[PDB]
Write a protein that binds this ligand. Sequence first.
Ligand SMILES: Nc1nc2c(ncn2[C@H]2C[C@H](O)[C@@H](COP(=O)(O)NP(=O)(O)OP(=O)(O)O)O2)c(=O)[nH]1
Ligand SMILES: [Mg+2]
Ligand SMILES: [Mg+2]
Length: 430
Amino acid sequence: GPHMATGQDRVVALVDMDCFFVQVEQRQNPHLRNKPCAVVQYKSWKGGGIIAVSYEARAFGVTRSMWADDAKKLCPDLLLAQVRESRGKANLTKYREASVEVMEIMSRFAVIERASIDEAYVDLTSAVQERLQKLQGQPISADLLPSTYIEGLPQGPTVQKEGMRKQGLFQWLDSLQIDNLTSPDLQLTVGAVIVEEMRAAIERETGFQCSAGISHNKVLAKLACGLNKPNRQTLVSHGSVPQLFSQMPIRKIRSLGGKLGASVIEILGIEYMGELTQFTESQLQSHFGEKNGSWLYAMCRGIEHDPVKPRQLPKTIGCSKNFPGKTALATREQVQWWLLQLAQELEERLTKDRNDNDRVATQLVVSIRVQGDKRLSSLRRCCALTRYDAHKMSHDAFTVIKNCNTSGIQTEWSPPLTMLFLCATKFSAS
DNA sequence: ATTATGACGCT
DNA sequence: AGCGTCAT
Ligand SMILES: Nc1nc2c(ncn2[C@H]2C[C@H](O)[C@@H](COP(=O)(O)NP(=O)(O)OP(=O)(O)O)O2)c(=O)[nH]1
Ligand SMILES: [Mg+2]
Ligand SMILES: [Mg+2]
């Protein structure tokens, strides 16, 4: 009753760039704009592997993870941009720099948590309180929400998508009690006004379009963001959760798309997030552990407490390359040369990071995969990172991995290596 | 031969 | 510390 917390204390937004790498390439090359196009890494094997797809190309069935040759079968006029190659490997610098452009704009409005190269959470609670004081009980005009959808509306008592959007928005705004400065629905609405402004700023100052979700916590904001992509934002209220979750496959919620989500489905004999409400917190904890159980009990009611962390910069800086099938590294000279290539890219990125961000990494993590292992990493070993020198980093990585070499011969490497990975971690202020 | 990352939980 | 999971 009156003591049952409803998880309506915060206003949280999730901003995700639409087809990011594609937009970066379309800004640089206007010939790619408003066209079916995709971004690929490498080229020789099946035309390269697609990692980003414009919405025009998605209409033909083009997806991430698809080989470009296969994509061309679905979309013969598909245009392709290739990721830059440096020191024999894909180099993603252009997209990391474009990311910084966007994240610095977002940081003007509120503290953000960088969740990936193209998305960030925003805690708008305080900004919303400020705007509400400025409004002075003035109603919110639909003109202030020109790209906002209200999930679950319209309802009750009409052909085109924009007319649907506007009808739902008008139903929402008509039911708003702008008198109450602590109404959660009002707070969400003001949050959506601020996010319209943030997205306008991003597009004006970078040329990039994005989508966004506005809700009371990170998981609902993330889910909302995907409901109306591209170039739109969606508000998911606390009240919309029962209907939304009643037909929501468990796998659609962040964290449940893998083995745990499959176990929830299999053990409980359910399919949708809303079915979880029928179990007690102790029941869920008994199946999925104390932490997962409490999280599921709250999440199926729309409640989640994970804070937006004040963290605009990545916590690690890493360099990885796969060596599939017959390109695996089977000599010591090979392994040394590629450790050096990775280490040289890492040195360049670390030196730039130190100059920009006033910090130094102190730990080097070396991960490898050996032929036959189906795991991402076969082995992971750390050593100290005391100088930004690629030859030293690569020599140290070799020293910590050289005992994996089964070959009695000194020149050969067996079993051959199918992946190398260097990761700088444990940053300190400098 | 699905690649290149990044975050975070467990023990 | 080293390994596993999840995202994409
Ligand atoms: N290297 C690499 N980059 C990837 C991979 N997957 C994604 N990226 C890169 C390329 C992506 O552009 C970028 C952002 O990932 P999203 O937000 O998941 N996809 P997007 O922004 O394209 O479309 P949407 O409009 O649906 O949000 O991350 C991968 O497997 N490998
Ligand atoms: Mg995106
Ligand atoms: Mg994203």
